[PDB]
Design an enzyme around this catalytic site. Structure first.
Site, PDB file in Angstrom:
ATOM      1  N   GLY A  34      52.239  77.816   8.356  1.00 43.92           N
ATOM      2  CA  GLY A  34      50.820  77.706   8.019  1.00 43.92           C
ATOM      3  C   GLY A  34      50.377  76.318   7.583  1.00 43.92           C
ATOM      4  N   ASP A 149      57.494  80.832  -2.295  1.00 53.26           N
ATOM      5  CA  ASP A 149      57.432  81.123  -0.860  1.00 53.26           C
ATOM      6  C   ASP A 149      58.827  81.400  -0.272  1.00 53.26           C
ATOM      7  OD1 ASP A 149      55.918  81.666   1.423  1.00 53.26           O
ATOM      8  OD2 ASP A 149      55.668  79.551   1.992  1.00 53.26           O
ATOM      9  N   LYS A 151      61.306  83.183   1.741  1.00 49.57           N
ATOM     10  CA  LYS A 151      61.269  83.977   2.969  1.00 49.57           C
ATOM     11  C   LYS A 151      62.331  83.429   3.917  1.00 49.57           C
ATOM     12  CE  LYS A 151      57.188  81.627   4.921  1.00 49.57           C
ATOM     13  NZ  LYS A 151      55.939  81.955   5.652  1.00 49.57           N
ATOM     14  N   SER A 152      62.754  84.241   4.906  1.00 51.40           N
ATOM     15  CA  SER A 152      63.753  83.851   5.912  1.00 51.40           C
ATOM     16  C   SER A 152      63.353  82.617   6.719  1.00 51.40           C
ATOM     17  CB  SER A 152      64.076  85.022   6.829  1.00 51.40           C
ATOM     18  OG  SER A 152      62.894  85.491   7.453  1.00 51.40           O
ATOM     19  N   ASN A 154      61.984  80.106   5.425  1.00 51.98           N
ATOM     20  CA  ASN A 154      62.212  78.997   4.478  1.00 51.98           C
ATOM     21  C   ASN A 154      63.662  78.926   3.989  1.00 51.98           C
ATOM     22  OD1 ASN A 154      59.485  78.456   4.894  1.00 51.98           O
ATOM     23  ND2 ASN A 154      58.786  79.118   2.893  1.00 51.98           N
ATOM     24  N   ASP A 167      60.897  74.067   2.138  1.00 51.01           N
ATOM     25  CA  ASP A 167      59.448  74.204   2.052  1.00 51.01           C
ATOM     26  C   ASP A 167      58.986  74.520   0.626  1.00 51.01           C
ATOM     27  OD1 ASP A 167      58.694  73.984   5.123  1.00 51.01           O
ATOM     28  OD2 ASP A 167      60.421  75.285   4.959  1.00 51.01           O
TER      29      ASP A 167
HETATM   30  C1  LIG Z   1      66.382  74.028  15.381  1.00 49.60           C
HETATM   31  N1  LIG Z   1      65.449  73.939  14.255  1.00 49.60           N
HETATM   32  C2  LIG Z   1      65.477  73.067  13.242  1.00 49.60           C
HETATM   33  C3  LIG Z   1      64.430  73.445  12.383  1.00 49.60           C
HETATM   34  N2  LIG Z   1      64.108  72.901  11.115  1.00 49.60           N
HETATM   35  C4  LIG Z   1      64.703  71.797  10.563  1.00 49.60           C
HETATM   36  O1  LIG Z   1      65.591  71.158  11.123  1.00 49.60           O
HETATM   37  C5  LIG Z   1      64.273  71.425   9.193  1.00 49.60           C
HETATM   38  C6  LIG Z   1      65.018  70.587   8.344  1.00 49.60           C
HETATM   39  N3  LIG Z   1      64.451  70.453   7.123  1.00 49.60           N
HETATM   40  N4  LIG Z   1      63.327  71.183   7.165  1.00 49.60           N
HETATM   41  C7  LIG Z   1      62.423  71.332   6.103  1.00 49.60           C
HETATM   42  C8  LIG Z   1      61.358  72.168   6.298  1.00 49.60           C
HETATM   43  C9  LIG Z   1      61.266  72.816   7.580  1.00 49.60           C
HETATM   44  N5  LIG Z   1      60.085  73.717   7.751  1.00 49.60           N
HETATM   45  C10 LIG Z   1      59.950  74.673   8.907  1.00 49.60           C
HETATM   46  C11 LIG Z   1      58.459  74.853   9.144  1.00 49.60           C
HETATM   47  C12 LIG Z   1      58.190  75.803  10.308  1.00 49.60           C
HETATM   48  C13 LIG Z   1      58.811  77.164  10.045  1.00 49.60           C
HETATM   49  C14 LIG Z   1      60.328  77.052   9.799  1.00 49.60           C
HETATM   50  C15 LIG Z   1      60.644  76.081   8.661  1.00 49.60           C
HETATM   51  N6  LIG Z   1      60.233  76.675   7.352  1.00 49.60           N
HETATM   52  N7  LIG Z   1      62.125  72.662   8.628  1.00 49.60           N
HETATM   53  C16 LIG Z   1      63.147  71.826   8.397  1.00 49.60           C
HETATM   54  C17 LIG Z   1      63.837  74.565  13.001  1.00 49.60           C
HETATM   55  C18 LIG Z   1      62.684  75.373  12.473  1.00 49.60           C
HETATM   56  F1  LIG Z   1      62.800  75.624  11.180  1.00 49.60           F
HETATM   57  F2  LIG Z   1      61.536  74.753  12.631  1.00 49.60           F
HETATM   58  F3  LIG Z   1      62.571  76.549  13.069  1.00 49.60           F
HETATM   59  N8  LIG Z   1      64.455  74.857  14.136  1.00 49.60           N
END
Ligand SMILES: Cn1cc(NC(=O)c2cnn3ccc(N[C@@H]4CCCC[C@@H]4N)nc23)c(C(F)(F)F)n1
Length: 292
Positions: A34, A149, A151-152, A154, A167
């Site tokens: 979001g 927040d 959740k899976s 996060n 997050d």
């Molecule tokens: C292959 N792959 C790698 C990532 N994420 C990261 O590598 C990442 C590293 N630190 N970090 C910090 C916050 C963050 N927030 C996202 C926001 C979209 C909803 C999911 C998460 N809560 N993602 C990350 C993802 C996915 F999470 F987006 F699905 N897929």
């Protein structure tokens, strides 16, 4: 802790101009929430996750800036092996960006759904994830921080499937009340839906995560009965069903004894009365006992 200050144009450049196409088709978008979109990048000889904040839901530009500041603030104070690692940020450009160590296995939400055809997580992997996530929450609570927040989506997974809480835009320092009710409905404790701010709400949300881990089911499914996963606790208690009827079938190493032990932790976390829920140290102890 102080962070690296990245150029907006360096981040724009290494994410193929913030390519909103999926990885599979040559794009850089790994996921979206979001409050932003996460892009794959390669900066200073390292694969990174670039989170470009944008909303997308409500949202005051100041509210988003306050979440950007809140995330940097929590990361500067909190460094733990079960928390994501922030490398830096970007403010100079138009969009606000957060740079993290890339999590190759993405989110627990996507791995539980086997999104893009990834193999199902084993019960052995699930137990380590539950323990790791509980260690991450314990660290936050010990440092007087409320996530708000949990959740899976996060809970991120590294190259070894180690659980990393992420997050922290909505996180709060530490019962208080707020006029701005934030979080994800399907995971929120009743008092959090009413405006209360307490670490006891994080425990409840973690209880929902533990049910997602056991069942492999999303917290909310409109085309499902019950639509909300937390309602399963009552179906089991009112003896209409057993936890065995809900165990994710996409595992071949899940024994009934340890699954029931994780369900018992989830059930306790999901107590409707905040004061009756265990604290995070008790959750950790029980999850550690589960694999001993
Ligand atoms: C292959 N792959 C790698 C990532 N994420 C990261 O590598 C990442 C590293 N630190 N970090 C910090 C916050 C963050 N927030 C996202 C926001 C979209 C909803 C999911 C998460 N809560 N993602 C990350 C993802 C996915 F999470 F987006 F699905 N897929």
């Amino acid at each position: 802790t102080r962070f690296h200050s990245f150029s907006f144009y360096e981040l724009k450049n290494v994410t193929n101009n913030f390519d909103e196409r999926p990885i599979s088709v040559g794009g850089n978008k790994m996921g979206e929430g979001g409050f932003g979109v996460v892009y794959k990048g390669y900066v200073n000889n390292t694969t990174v996750a670039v989170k470009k904040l944008a909303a997308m839901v409500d949202i005051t530009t100041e509210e988003l800036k306050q979440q950007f500041d809140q995330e940097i603030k929590v990361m500067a104070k909190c460094q733990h092996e079960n928390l994501v690692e922030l490398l830096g940020f970007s403010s100079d450009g138009d969009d606000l960006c957060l740079v993290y160590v890339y999590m190759p296995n993405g989110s627990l939400l996507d791995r539980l759904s086997c999104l893009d055809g990834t193999p199902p997580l084993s019960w052995h992997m699930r137990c380590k994830i539950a323990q790791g996530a509980a260690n991450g929450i314990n660290f936050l609570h010990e440092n007087h921080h409320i996530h708000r927040d949990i959740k899976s989506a996060n809970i991120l997974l590294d190259e070894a499937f180690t659980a990393k809480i992420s997050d922290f835009g909505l996180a709060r320092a530490s019962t208080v009340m707020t006029s701005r009710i934030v979080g994800t409905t399907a995971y929120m404790a009743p008092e959090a839906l009413r405006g209360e701010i307490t670490p006891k709400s994080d425990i409840y949300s973690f209880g929902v995560v533990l049910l997602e881990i056991i069942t492999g089911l999303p917290a909310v499914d409109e085309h499902r009965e019950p639509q909300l996963l937390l309602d399963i606790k009552e179906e089991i208690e009112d003896e209409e069903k057993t936890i065995e009827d809900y165990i994710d079938k996409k595992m071949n190493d899940a024994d009934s004894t340890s699954v029931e032990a994780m369900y018992s932790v989830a059930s306790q976390c999901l107590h409707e009365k905040k004061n009756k829920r265990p604290d995070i140290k008790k959750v950790q102890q029980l999850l550690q006992e589960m694999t001993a």
